[PDB]
Design a protein around this ligand. Structure first.
Ligand code: SF4
Length: 81
């Protein structure tokens, strides 16, 4: 499986990820991205049909703020660092 999460501490509010993967990422009132699948907790497996969009958003993010992993993040975007 795949899980994804935004590191809100590094996001620069550029609007690219919601364009790449609108069913996965949206934004708070200040434009900081978050994963809508699971309220940015990194615990809901990304649907198979959405993985390619997820990878577009992940690869495109200018500040490497989107994380992807094969195990849940359990709330911590920096778990695998
Ligand atoms: S693409 Fe990256 S920097 Fe831009 S809004 Fe999404 S998470 Fe933030």
């Amino acid at each position: 499986p795949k899980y994804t999460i935004v590191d809100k501490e590094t996001c620069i509010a550029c609007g690219a990820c919601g364009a790449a993967a609108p069913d996965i990422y949206d934004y708070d009132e200040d434009g900081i991205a978050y994963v809508t699948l699971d309220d940015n907790q990194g615990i809901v497996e990304v649907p198979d049909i959405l993985i390619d969009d997820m990878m577009d958003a992940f690869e495109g993010c200018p500040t490497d703020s989107i994380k992807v992993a094969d195990e849940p993040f359990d709330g911590d975007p920096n778990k695998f660092e």
